[PDB]
Symmetry: C5
């Protein structure tokens, strides 16, 4: 055997009982699988690499070049114990074998690689849905060793994060990948060092626009045509308002069937509910004209001024509301 | 080797055949995942810590400080056998390795930590839905050892429970974390010690109000516009009541399609069913006016008093019902 | 080592080549998780205990008391091989370790406990849905040993079954737990012994009543008010019947969207389909009156008798049908 | 030990380097779990038994009777390598232990049994849905050994297949179980022998009839009453046709929301789409009558013959179509 | 033993520290399970074969023929480390044992076969849905060895890919299977060689046509009947347009409820929304006639020209739009 595995005890870290051992980390992101709003999490697949030195793995050679081993020797040597903080579930691919790589230099330098899929929690705010921007992060930390025994740092500073050119999402836009570092404290174990991977997401508005705002505006404009019909055609102006109310209710239910039950109001609800009031007030206007006409004719025993005023009042108010709404929320 | 593992038989607990061995427990809660009403359970992620002493793991040193081992030595020494009572499923995270920590002091004190995710049953009452308050608990107990062989207690009394600052739920509010203790009895094995973790949850009423109560009140008020329309316009009052009835039925079905099939009446059912009776009587009110008009005119061969009374009778009754309902349920 | 594990071959049952070995069984039911109607199964969590004697496990002592071992010694001694018949899936809980208990007396008596979750098939008949009663059972049997090698029996007869006081179902009522025994035969292996656990379930009628029967009766009564409207009000009697038909069809679809596709008619189907027929004939009655009026007026060139008869005939028939239905099905 | 495991190498089949070894198979079917139309597969649970002889397992005895071993000795002896062809997923039950049986006769005959659950693909044709008949099969084959090294055959000819008396499907009828044999060829490995298990399935027509054909016929008959109403009552004949069209569209959508997106037309689609044309022609027929009367009145300035003809034309054509459809598709 | 497994160290590849070792690959595709549009992936099952030579496995014989071993010897010898790039999940079937074949020639040639199921990501374009054509591929690569240690190539060039004749999809058509080769580069490990398996898919248009385009055309043609009715029949022309608008909105919602939320407009979206505009303009046409009639009579105090022109204008425009649409997309 080239390596003297049987001559050492690998249940203790290198430099046991002494100074800490530095460990480097490199990360390459392969793809983002899915994003969930009800559960508030996301999925990511990446390659994780570790760098450290162990003098117990030295072997004699002349070329001074890295040598690759099959990978089943990992269960016989010491290996770091990194884990993902605030994760829900994760696994390692094992087809057709474990996706593990192990390269050892003659002096004792070791390279270790893995391929994992991780689901992690991300807190999102929907106060501007569906015109919002979200920020998420992925955290890496050692589980058993504190900063007094294991120091964790990025191998090459910012240049330690690589991304695939095929990363794409059908619903979002991904930008601004960067890495940071911070310390963590646990009340009963000690201090630990954390690594972060940050990115930003932006939503696409075209689908939501064409699927929600256009039908609502169409129904609102359809509600207006009743003002141009003679009041003597009783079975001609009530069905318009009734069907517009029904369609607005159906649209509201369909839109609300998707997002989770938050405790605050979203941007889309403001537009939909105001448009419901405009349609609702249309029915009341006709009832007022009908009642006034009956009272006026009773005392005695053309177009009324109410319709002529409404034909100009309603569109101006709707346009002003739309301008304000699209100026506030951009 | 620093530890003499092979020199002892670890199939027996320390102090075998003698007095019980005290074991301490510490718990830190990381996050609350989800809550289900159809299945009546919840998911939690936490860190579990154990404290005990074993003289067979003593090693000589001078600094008198804890030493950390990799973690694969756990399956070669004795370890407690705690489990979660009334759980549906659970697992231990194993990425990139088993989330296990092991620190041993020179005298023989041992620290053992784990990271687990548990789903546990919680019995909930929906008599005041959606203005109810729910209380749940998580139970920890030893499986194989009775009170005469293993004594279980909290390490620091009330101060043994810590919570993360990011624990939150989009639909519930979390409060009042505390711990208790109690004994349990099994008819064929003996007495055991149990530990409890208690918390309280409160719902948010904004979404339910805006999504259910407002449309029902709007429909009820819409049904009142038929009283101010002349009775000679037959195709002007029946469709209003018809569409209000259809909308109320659709709303009731949509609300009831989510909650489980309980055997008692909830608070939301009272409001929806009573308002359904008000809309139903609107159609019957029109029938009485129409029938009496025909009878009077036939014997013979302005506004009727029935509508004049109804216009004041209905809103007062509805307001009184709303006041009583919101006084009972606050 | 207190036990001489290495001095024997544990690949053979105790008393190999001789008389059969008795085995006892104790069961305690913890909870019932869920019940599925489309899949026709149920889920149960329980504790399973075995009692047998093996002289190869005897050890010297003086107190004559049971001694508890950790549980990893099970994989080196002989253990029975019970399994659940007609089960779809099952597993053993493994948090934080395998839920296994092992106690050995000095003479050789052994106790073995497990915690398992089992999903088993149950045949259900929905001819009286939703006023039906269902009976299900759970079966236990030895897989490899026949009655000539292993005898299976209840440890204490009837008193071998215990239930928790927290067992409950939101939609059913649990009662009448009891145990039986029966022999089984396989055409190519021999005779085996079986154990049974029986229980009964009863539904709750409040939800189904309030969700299905009341709206149908309300719609049927709504269809009756058209008889009190003058036939000259053409847009007053057709929309009522049309909307009642649409509502009845929607209710039928909603009810059928849950139960599986059985080959027989259910009790709830009879009540709904009869109601739809009554509403269907109401529309035809209006056409009969209208057609006769045109024919009568043509020859020539008040309330019709048909309506007067129907106003009394229809409610009596509906009440008679309801009385007969509620007397037959209790 | 009774068996000399350590004295032989079990990495080679019996008769290695020589003639092939015969292996017999017996199968008992326990239950059929479910059938999927969108995924086109089914689930089955069965017992699989193997028969062969190995002289290395001979042990001395005088009674000449089969002896049963616990089952953990399987991983130390040679065992066949059968697998299910065209399967999607499968597993072996392991509660409370692996469902494995092993009986060895004194001369060397071996019996080996397993309990497995298999999901397999079946190609189905829906040209006659829902009056179709489906035929599926399950295939068993050796993976690594060719016909020159392992000969596979049924142990007892036709009598090698047994079925439980509790096998039933809520929607299908099961009949005609039988077994066949055939050879298979792979372009780069050689020839293999296959075993088949065949059965037949038939559907139940009651649910589909009651849920689809009855409402469609009711709507078609309802659309016919418009020919018996006076044409001067304009708000009396249009809602009937419009609501029948809406109901037919809803029924078609509900029926189509289940079956997968096939590339051809199904039998149920023929009946529903033809009835849609009959209702559609009713609206156009009404429009033609109204236009002709207006033209006739303008030139000048009782029931029209078109309705009188239609009252006889429509029912006869519908009855003829029903007779043809129910004769073609039985 | 025939093979000297224990006499060598199999943690190093053949020719360790020297030239690369060629490896051949053969693939036979069994079936394609499903295709997902929301997740944009596909599932495939196949047999994977490897060819290489190792002198350490030589054994003496005279027949010079391949010898088959059971399959558990794989975990004691060196074996390649292939994996699937851009995959989501995968597994190896293990019923009733691991589906592994191992044949070794006397000189040292080794054959290794596996049966796996893989899910891979495919980027799809829905610009021409549902008249589009999709191209997907599957990638194979080595994980730990670079091109300087392991050379990967197809065993027989193009003739290394075989397909089963039972491969079929209910919604797609499969054609054009071929293989390619390309190099890959990672910034921190080196160069690797990849293999590709390409195929093409085409959709079936009959279902989408019959289910979406026919109802829309029927509704559009139905909306045209309002032009042949006299304008004095006021309650005859509005409900037709209103109900057609409602049906069109329902159809649009049903179509859009399935496809993912893309940022571009699909081919089916163009056809449906243009049809909605035609029906929408019909209501405005009726309003224009009604208003102008009142104005003319007031000044004063037969068929309108607008309807006469529209009866010819609308069908011509619809036919022209259909011709252009079906010419653009073929
Ligand atoms: C005076 C009349 O005779 C007209 C005037 C307004 C009309 C209603 C307007 C909207 C709808 C909703 C629709 O729901 S649906 O989802 O099933 O399409 C069913 C039809 C219905 C109830 C109409 C029925 C006919 C009217 C009462
Ligand atoms: C690529 C590289 O670093 N090569 C070095 C080489 O230059 C040096 O002479 C040798 C000494 O052991 O170590 C190695
Ligand atoms: C956005 C951000 O943090 N950028 C930092 C940059 O400021 C720093 O100079 C560099 C070197 O560490 O790393 C990166
Ligand atoms: C932190 C701590 O407890 N340190 C103690 C130290 O004060 C004491 O002198 C020594 C004796 O063995 O044990 C250790
Ligand atoms: C609880 C119990 O059964 N105790 C008995 C004890 O009475 C008896 O003297 C002893 C003899 O070995 O065995 C044990
Ligand atoms: C309901 C039932 O089965 N009860 C039985 C009883 O008949 C029997 O005498 C007793 C003793 O085995 O066990 C119990
Ligand atoms: C049931 C059976 O086959 N029994 C036979 C027995 O008749 C025979 O004398 C013996 C010889 O070894 O082998 C065994
Ligand atoms: C099928 C085949 O290749 N057979 C050859 C045989 O012709 C040759 O004589 C022998 C020499 O070792 O090797 C083997
Ligand atoms: C918390 O623990 C302390 C000390 O054990 C006790 O005095 C106090 O009552 C406890 N509080 C609660 C709410 O149980
Ligand atoms: C059953 O098997 C027997 C003997 O192999 C054969 O004669 C008979 O035709 C078979 N029956 C069927 C239905 O295949
Ligand atoms: C198949 O392979 C041959 C030889 O390598 C090559 O000439 C041919 O172009 C290939 N065909 C395709 C479709 O790649
Ligand atoms: C940035 C796109 C805004 C689109 C607004 C559309 C308002 C009708
Ligand atoms: C529409 C009724 C509103 C009642 C608000 C009550 C807030 C507690
Ligand atoms: C709506 C009818 C209720 C009948 C209740 C009968 C209780 C046995
Ligand atoms: C709905 C018409 C059914 C006619 C009887 C069919 C019997 C196969
Ligand atoms: C009803 C429209 C049919 C169009 C057929 C087009 C076939 C390519
Ligand atoms: C809890 C009973 C409330 C009744 C309100 C009408
Ligand atoms: C037992 C027959 C029930 C039928 C009720 C109408
Ligand atoms: C199979 C086509 C039948 C058509 C009957 C009119
Ligand atoms: C891409 C534009 C298509 C227009 C069809 C009329
Ligand atoms: Cl009308």
């Amino acid at each position: 055997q080239l390596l003297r595995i049987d001559d050492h005890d690998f249940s203790m870290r290198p430099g046991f009982g002494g100074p800490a051992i530095p460990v480097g980390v490199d990360v390459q992101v392969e793809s983002l699988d899915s994003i969930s709003e009800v559960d508030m999490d996301f999925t990511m697949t990446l390659y994780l690499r570790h760098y450290w030195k162990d003098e117990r793995l030295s072997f004699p050679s002349t070329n001074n070049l890295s040598m690759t081993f099959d990978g089943r020797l990992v269960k016989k040597i010491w290996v770091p114990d990194m884990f993902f903080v605030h994760s829900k579930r994760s696994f390692i691919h094992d087809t057709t074998t474990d996706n593990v790589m192990l390269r050892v230099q003659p002096d004792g330098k070791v390279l270790y690689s893995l391929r994992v899929t991780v689901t992690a929690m991300c807190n999102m705010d929907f106060s501007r849905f569906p015109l919002d921007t979200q920020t998420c992060s992925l955290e890496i930390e050692s589980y058993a060793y504190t900063e007094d025994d294991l120091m964790l740092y990025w191998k090459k500073g910012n240049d330690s994060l690589k991304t695939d050119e095929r990363i794409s999402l059908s619903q979002f836009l991904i930008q601004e990948f960067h890495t940071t570092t911070k310390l963590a404290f646990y009340s009963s174990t000690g201090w630990y060092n954390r690594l972060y991977i940050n990115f930003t997401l932006r939503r696409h508005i075209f689908f939501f626009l064409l699927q929600t705002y256009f039908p609502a505006t169409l129904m609102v404009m359809l509600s207006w045509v009743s003002f141009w019909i003679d009041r003597r055609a009783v079975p001609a102006r009530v069905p318009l308002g009734i069907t517009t109310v029904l369609t607005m209710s159906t649209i509201i239910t369909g839109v609300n069937a998707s997002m989770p039950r938050v405790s605050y109001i979203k941007a889309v609800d403001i537009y939909l509910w105001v448009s419901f009031v405009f349609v609702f007030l249309s029915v009341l206007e006709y009832a007022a004209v009908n009642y006034l006409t009956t009272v006026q004719e009773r005392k005695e025993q053309d177009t009324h001024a109410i319709d002529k005023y409404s034909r100009i009042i309603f569109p101006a108010a709707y346009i002003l509301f739309n301008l304000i709404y699209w100026s506030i929320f951009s």
